[PDB]
Design a protein around this ligand. Sequence first.
Ligand SMILES: Nc1ncnc2c1ncn2[C@H]1C[C@H](O)[C@@H](COP(=O)(O)NP(=O)(O)OP(=O)(O)O)O1
Ligand SMILES: [Mg+2]
Ligand SMILES: [Mg+2]
Length: 428
Amino acid sequence: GPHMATGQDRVVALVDMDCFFVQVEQRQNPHLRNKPCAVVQYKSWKGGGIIAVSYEARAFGVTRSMWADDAKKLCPDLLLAQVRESRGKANLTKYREASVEVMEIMSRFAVIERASIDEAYVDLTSAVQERLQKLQGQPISADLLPSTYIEGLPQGPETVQKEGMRKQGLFQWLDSLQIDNLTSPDLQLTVGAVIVEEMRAAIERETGFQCSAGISHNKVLAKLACGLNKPNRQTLVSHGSVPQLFSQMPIRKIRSLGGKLGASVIEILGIEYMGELTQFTESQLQSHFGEKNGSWLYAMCRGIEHDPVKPRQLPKTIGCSKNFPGKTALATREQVQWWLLQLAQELEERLTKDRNDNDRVATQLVVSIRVQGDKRLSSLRRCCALTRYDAHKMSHDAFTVIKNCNTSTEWSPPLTMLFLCATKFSAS
DNA sequence: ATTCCACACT
DNA sequence: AGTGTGTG
Ligand SMILES: Nc1ncnc2c1ncn2[C@H]1C[C@H](O)[C@@H](COP(=O)(O)NP(=O)(O)OP(=O)(O)O)O1
Ligand SMILES: [Mg+2]
Ligand SMILES: [Mg+2]
């Protein structure tokens, strides 16, 4: 009763850019705007691999991981933009710089946690408290929430158009709000959504990029909410919406349950939906999935999660890798050294820029390889000191730490992947 | 022949 | 450390 926490203590948003690499390319090249379009890496093998897809192209069935030649079978007029290639590999610099544009705008509203190249979590609890004090008991107009969906509404007794439904649900929600009581979680989420509308408007005005967002009480629900009405919309998932939302929600849709652990939850417990987890005791879940996973699942299926929005706007590592599939696997010592150099040169360029922008220096170099035949993504990891931002030195050091893996002037078994990653940053 | 960050476990 | 999972 009065002592059961409900995980309604925070307001958390997740902002995720819509078809992000495609929008970067469409901003640059107006000929690509409002067209079925995709971004590809490489070109020689089957037209290149698609990594981002405009919503117009998705309507034809084009997806990420598809070869462009195959995508063109579904969508003959598909337009393509190619990722920059430097030193023999795809180079994502343009998208990292566009990401910085967006993250710097978001950081004006609140502390953000950079969760990927195109998304960040936002802890809005304080901003909401401030805005509720500014508001002075004044009701919130639907005009302040022009692109917001309230998950679960409308319910109960222009209904056949999407925007009509969005407005009906929003009206039900605002009609129900207690705009007195500044401690109401639903009111806090609603003010959060007002702020997120402002944040998304700022991103679009100042960059040209559209994005979606989720607003809820924690990161998992915010992330889930964001995807519910992409693109160019935001979704509020209230605590009270959780039981119905989760009652038909496949377990794999919840962040960190998309892989083996989620599969084992389904297999061991014989369930399909997140809500079914509520029927197990915390001890039962811990016995199957461990203390940490069990406690997390027990709270998460009730809409409760405590993972904090970490104050971290910058990546903690700077890495780059290249695959060498099938017959292209590296089979000579010289080949291995040349590609280690190419990777080290990209890494040096990125590290030097990072040191100037962010007042820090990496202190450890991590080298990872994959050998032909190994089913695992990475076969071996080794590390060494990173004492100078020098590509020739870094590539020589990586070779020194991996050369004894060579069973064999010849390299055996051939290498199917190289990976250099700078880690352990200290202030400079 | 999909390609190119963060964190748990031991 | 080094291995592995999950993410986007
Ligand atoms: N598996 C992958 N391999 C390579 N690049 C990838 C990738 N997944 C994503 N990227 C890159 C390319 C993506 O543009 C960018 C953001 O990833 P998302 O947010 O998952 N997908 P998007 O923003 O495109 O569409 P929307 O959010 O509207 O569904 O990261
Ligand atoms: Mg996105
Ligand atoms: Mg994303």
